[PDB]
Design a protein around this ligand. Structure first.
Ligand SMILES: Nc1nc(=O)c(CC(=O)Nc2cnc(C(=O)N[C@@H](CCC(=O)O)C(=O)O)c(F)c2)c(N)[nH]1
Ligand SMILES: Nc1nc(=O)c(CC(=O)Nc2cnc(C(=O)N[C@@H](CCC(=O)O)C(=O)O)c(F)c2)c(N)[nH]1
Ligand SMILES: Nc1ncnc2c1ncn2[C@@H]1O[C@H](COP(=O)(O)OP(=O)(O)O)[C@@H](O)[C@H]1O
Lengths: 298, 289
């Protein structure tokens, strides 16, 4: 039966580390780090998630604010705000919670944020640098997945890894980190990586996961991954956060992409949803904010 | 036996497309495109390849010059030259042939070329845009591999593909093009892609290639792919160009029984590399950023 990795405990340890580091930075008489978060509209998940981020900033010694804007705001208005904050020498990190409404182009917004305040790592320069194995602001969810693997001592060099999902801020950067050279400026995990997506036929997915020492599911599909697909002792990391309705009572429940109960038999490791990858995302963003405050990637 | 794909012939087709496009463009008022190539040192592969590029330029009606410099050139000189060429409005495309001498930072050189004139697609912005499936200057070898697959009619959507190698200008971009979404601004092939490299155990490689409708080898290792690694009827694309006693990364002679399609070396991907660069030069001349 599978060791269950608590991403909540790990995230909490990492927050303690950022706390000490912020205490230190300030005791040396530096400006306290400041994170600004922009939230557009009323997606409830977006609200909960931004709540989690600002709390985390509070508890690790980072000053936060959330600027909430109505969904009817124009792209131009959002850009004027971004520009104010890029020019405010008090703001170390600046993030815009996603998704944005359809009249606003996310890519133009992500590229408007100053690369050295880009704690999400979504600016095209950060994406380019990451894809070239250079130092960059790494994106929080993928770096969280990496820390779960690395801090649990699960090896990656030479190993087979499958990532279900190819989204530009989750699946793609996860696949990039895991396959790349450990000897490079930004080290990778030297694994053999397969990437699947919405057109991977389910039988062919299974044919690749069955060979996998590590399966990382970032598709947003309940019960995508089941124990017949996993091999004995493999690590299984679950990036999905899927809001379902619970058969016994149609209560609103969070599952991931893995059939936890089925897979926790056969697997060597497993993360739960909730309390797995999600809090790690919040922890790695605290890390990026301290990094941005210390202006080390200038 | 396997259908042997002629890169020589597909490249001919592409170069005729560019010739026509260039001729309409000049005919309708515009400056004739110009490609400037910077060559440093005496690597015989580099010299041969830069000659192939400028010949192709000449025959599709694109003006060229190669600027040859000694290996001894300093990084500051090379950047000075690049800066001059970035400002010369006669120059549409600018490329610096690799590899550069060990005392020159390649990445610094690559980022110094104006993105508008970056016909190799090695500038960090071009790499970033490509990884986001945005319009970009696609790198020549990866776009060549893509054109080989799509002009030969080999399907990719839902299919299994293995790329052997993860170099930033070949193997990584090939994997990026093949797995990405056909509906995006810069379409991809909607395939299921495995990337392998110098730490993939050979048996594990084989366990992936066995499943593969397409195997693309960009490792630079003679005989890495052998017919027991292929599944019958599969497309094998050989990006390797190795000096031994020129051959690929495939055992051509063996794999051609088992394979559905196969590319030779020479005459496969290499001539396509040259062709796609001509494509990129006319795209740069037209200033469709
Ligand atoms: N600019 C930008 N950047 C981004 O990074 C992201 C991604 C992101 O914020 N992800 C998450 C994920 N999970 C949590 C979390 O708290 N998860 C808990 C459950 C809490 C509950 O159910 O409400 C868990 O999974 O246990 C979080 F705070 C943030 C977006 N959308 N936008
Ligand atoms: N900035 C930059 N950009 C780059 O794109 C490249 C890569 C590159 O130039 N690739 C190639 C590959 N092959 C050929 C070729 O003509 N191959 C013939 C064999 C001819 C013979 O040497 O006898 C074949 O394979 O049939 C070519 F002209 C260029 C580099 N290095 N640098
Ligand atoms: N056994 C192997 N299987 C797959 N890829 C390999 C193997 N051995 C080496 N490689 C890869 O080949 C590449 C060598 O780089 P390079 O020669 O610069 O690229 P190219 O083949 O495009 O010229 C590296 O990415 C390396 O990890």
């Amino acid at each position: 039966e599978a060791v269950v990795i608590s991403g909540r405990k790990l995230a909490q340890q990492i927050k303690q580390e950022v706390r000490q580091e912020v205490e230190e930075w300030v005791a040396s008489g530096n400006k306290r780090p400041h994170l600004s978060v922009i939230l557009v509209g009323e997606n409830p998940a977006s609200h909960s998630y931004v709540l989690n981020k600002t709390r985390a900033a509070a508890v690790v010694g980072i000053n936060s604010e959330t600027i909430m804007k109505p969904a009817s705001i124009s792209e131009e208005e959002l850009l004027n705000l971004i520009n104010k904050l890029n020019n405010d020498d008090n703001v170390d990190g600046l993030l815009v919670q996603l998704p944005l409404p359809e009249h606003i182009d996310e890519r133009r917004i992500c590229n408007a944020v100053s690369p050295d305040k880009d704690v999400d790592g979504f600016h095209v320069i950060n994406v380019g640098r990451m894809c070239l194995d250079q130092y960059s602001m790494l994106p929080a969810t993928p770096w969280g997945v990496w820390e779960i693997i690395k801090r649990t001592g699960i090896p990656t060099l030479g190993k087979n890894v499958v990532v279900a999902g190819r989204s530009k801020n989750v699946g793609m950067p996860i696949a990039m980190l895991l396959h790349t050279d450990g000897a490079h400026e930004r080290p990778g995990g030297d694994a053999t990586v397969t990437i699947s997506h919405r057109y991977t036929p389910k039988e062919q997915l299974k044919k690749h996961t069955i060979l996998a020492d590590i399966v990382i599911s970032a598709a947003g599909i309940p019960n995508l991954i089941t124990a017949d697909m996993i091999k004995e002792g493999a690590a299984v990391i679950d990036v999905g956060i899927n809001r379902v309705h619970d058969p016994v009572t149609a209560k609103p429940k969070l599952v991931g992409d893995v059939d936890f109960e089925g897979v926790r038999q056969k697997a060597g490791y497993i993360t739960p949803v909730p309390g797995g990858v999600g809090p790690m995302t919040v922890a790695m963003l605290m890390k990026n904010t301290i990094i941005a405050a210390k202006k080390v990637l200038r």
